[model samples]
Target: SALKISHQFPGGTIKEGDFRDRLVRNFAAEVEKRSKGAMKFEIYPGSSLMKTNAQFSSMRKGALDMALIPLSYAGGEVPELNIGLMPGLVVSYEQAYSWKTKPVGIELTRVLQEKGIVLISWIWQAGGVASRGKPVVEPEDAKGMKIRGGSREMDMILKDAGAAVVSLPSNEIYAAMQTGAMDAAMTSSTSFISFRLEEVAKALTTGRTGAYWFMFEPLMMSKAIFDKLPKDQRDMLMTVGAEMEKFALEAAKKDDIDVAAVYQKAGAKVVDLSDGTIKKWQDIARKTAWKDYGAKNEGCAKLLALAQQTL
Candidate 1:
């Protein structure tokens, strides 16, 4: 039987020019090789089957067999999952790594499954700050500037930085920047090219705490579709998911330099914010943003306490 796995990147895959392509190709090959052709996958990339806003519903309804969706995209339904994007939240790759392996990450997945989605491994990438026009140096620099943001926590953090945070879809960001609708955007290194914003942005603010490197995308199959898979195949898929995660993060670290180089060549200046400013961002995240988010979700306290513990 042909197993259809959906993705949001184009060509039903990310291109050779993109790190995302590397991720998909490797995983697809692994699945085929491990299954010995007994199982096969047909990929639907560039959201050919499901757009970001509709992905969770499609998965839950079993309209698509599987997907790798950003947790931020599911904010409307799974708001807590957006915790991964809290600006200046997790500071280093070590903190990011520990956070994923911690109880919080597991709890996040559990919350999703309860809503009809399944958990997969966290794929890590380098997340930092960038601006659409001006270089962000200090707090007031962000004042009155409208920045593109990924989650509620990001929005709140931006507000503290004196910027107006606008929650817009990632696909719409480039157009928004081109039209002067957004002045800054926070994103990952890999995403700069993925969203085609390298040309639109002019500066990268540095020393910001790295965002969650390991992000919650899925090795997801619709529960109904998963139920149909022979027991052994299902187990293989689960095991493969873990291996694929390790592979993705390992690749992501290397891709960070390439992504930044692409952005730098596009006329963007990367500025390293001071340790003081970075710490300020973290303080705001803890004081204002995290507390509010924690109150809304039961597992928040547990995740908060355990996250970044290894660091």
Candidate 2:
């Protein structure tokens, strides 16, 4: 029997050569082929299935079997789980994998199971800071600037760097930027056109000018469904998931280059940070943000330590 699953993303927003579409479409196909027809993912692109705010609760209640979620977007409810999704740490595919495969990762799965959801794979969404009102070149440039932050970690990191971190929901970011309510924002290259941000704002400080991190867009399964699967079937899912995790990383990296090129064509000013500059950003972000974040929550401490160990 094929289990029905759904996904939410604005597929039509992808114009000519949208990298997000390419990745999302390929990921969907991979799920279909790997499931061998035993599971059918009925993707509902463009929020046709449910509103952004409703998906999590819908999945939690079993109204839906699974959800691919951005953990940061759900931070308002569960601050602890979304902790690592901050602006700066866990900045690359390797760092993300090490953190997700560690003891802390296992614990996160347990926590999700308790919430009636299941962990799948975390996907990378390349993020960086872009300024419309000004060109942000260094940590000092962000000081006192009202930059939009996507997560608790984002807020903490920028605040530590002396910026007034303005927390905003992801959906509101483009409008905020357009309305001049935000001087700068953290987003992915994929979003430049998809969100129409390239039209309103023109400059993008490139390279490691801001944070680069991957968080949970875990291809989750319903706990009940997972439990009912035959032992072999369950094992098969795990095996495929582990393999797909690696594949997704390679996919995201390719998308990163292509998407950046697209943004460049749109006239976004690109700022390339030097290696020394990037190193300084990483060091300062970790020292000021993660350490203090870990100090407050024992779970976070364990998770952060395990992530560092695994990486």
Candidate 3:
């Protein structure tokens, strides 16, 4: 009998859309092929099956089978999770990916597993700013503006840069900017396109080169559900999940380039950050976001120390 796994993600296409969505679709296809139909998947894209905010909780309770979700979405409940999207912490895909084998990666995995979740595939994304007025490539450009920084740690960094912080999910950014609620929104490059911010943004600070935003958005399975699976199926699932990481890495990098082109074609002025500008943002992040996150608790401080070793 084929055990069906319903997978949920916020964006991308079931056929050929956002890379994150494509990642899920690709994973499901590969699992079916390798497992020989012992396992199957049904994918729900664009929050079609549930609300975006609800996905994490659903997975925690085993109410959902699997999800490719932004790990920081759980930060409110688990403060340490906020580090997943901390500003300037992970400046490149390589550093972000390296966390899997590093001490921080092992601890993060332990923390998630303790909370009833299992990491399947590790996915990382670099982000940029989409602004309504001017490109926010430097710290000064953000002064006095209402910016959506994606997560609380990121918001703390923006506040340090003298910007008013706006908290909202990536999906709400388009409407917020359209209504003058936000002057700029920082999110993953894939999200900048999938959320259709090109319609509202007049400029883009692309993440393809010398940028400061990187996120941990991994494919996860509910531990309760996973524990119920047959041992052979579970073993096969882990093997397939490991193989899917290469596909995710390549697709995300492509989106970094493609997003800039998409914004330019929409008539927005696209800008790339310089090394000095990246350092400027990182300086603020270190003093504010990083410093604040490190003070949360021993576990958090330990992870922060381990993560910094990669730098």
Candidate 4:
């Protein structure tokens, strides 16, 4: 039986747009090859197979097979997972990727298993801001703008800075920006390219110099489906998944640099935040989002503590 994998991002060839989609497409082929065609997959991108918000919940109930979902998308249902997208917590790619080898990684994965999800590949994307007027590298720059920050944790910081916050999926940002309903949006650097934000945005804050918005959006599978696999296939899946992490890391890192170029080529002013500038944003996050996330519950508090140790 072929695994049905779904994701919200627009689909393209393994050689093209949206590396996250490409990652999954590559994953399908690799797993099939490694498993000698014993394992196969059919990908459903753009939320065509199911509603985007329902993916995490469906995975928990064994209704969906797999997805490449932003962990924070289900933060309401899995409150502890909110920590993944907490602003300023993951500053650098290395520090962020280190989580899988650290204590917090194990705990985070355990939390997923508890809810009936199994991590397949760990993918973290660096985030950038595309704005209507100016580069939003500092907290003060966000004042008076209607910005979409992708999560409550991120919005908490933006909102505290006096900007109005909008919560929506990445695919919707282009529409909001186009209609002037949104002034700026912060999301994975790859998104700025895939969604063609450079067309609507006047300024770009690149994530290349280190960002306060690295997000954990892993490729995941339903634990129920995973547990039912034969031992050989299970081993193949795990091995292939681990291998994909390296591929994703390279794409994300390149996306950070490529996003800046893409925006600049489109005539938008591009700038990278200085360490001092990111610190100003982090100060706001620490005072607001970090403490608030920890107080959600004991489990959250525990996970946050472990996450902090990596940096």
Could you say which candidate leads in TM-score? Answer: 4
Candidates in order have lDDT scores of: 0.66, 0.63, 0.84, 0.90
Which parts of model 1 are misplaced by more than 4 Å?
A: 10-15, 206-215, 308-311
TM-score, cand. 1 vs. native: 0.87
The TM-score of candidate 4 is 0.98
Q: Write the per-residue lDDT of candidate 3 for residues 15-118, one digit (tens) a residue.
A: 67787777777778888888787778887776777777887888889888888878887898887888889866787888888889788899999999988989
Q: State TM-scores per candidate.
A: 0.87, 0.83, 0.95, 0.98
Collision count of model 1 = 4
**Cα displacement (Å) at residue 60, model 1:** 1.8
Q: What is the C-alpha RMSD of each candidate to the true structure, in Å?
A: 2.8, 3.4, 1.8, 1.0
TM-score of model 2 vs. true structure: 0.83
Candidate 3 positional error at 292, Å: 1.5
Could you tell which candidate, 2 or 3, scores higher by lDDT?
A: 3
Task: In angstroms, give how far residue 120 of model 4 lies from its true place.
Answer: 0.5
For 203-242, candidate 1 gives per-residue lDDT tens digits of: 8763333333234454566776776778887877777777
Off by over 4 Å in 2: 1-8, 12-36, 208-214, 229-236
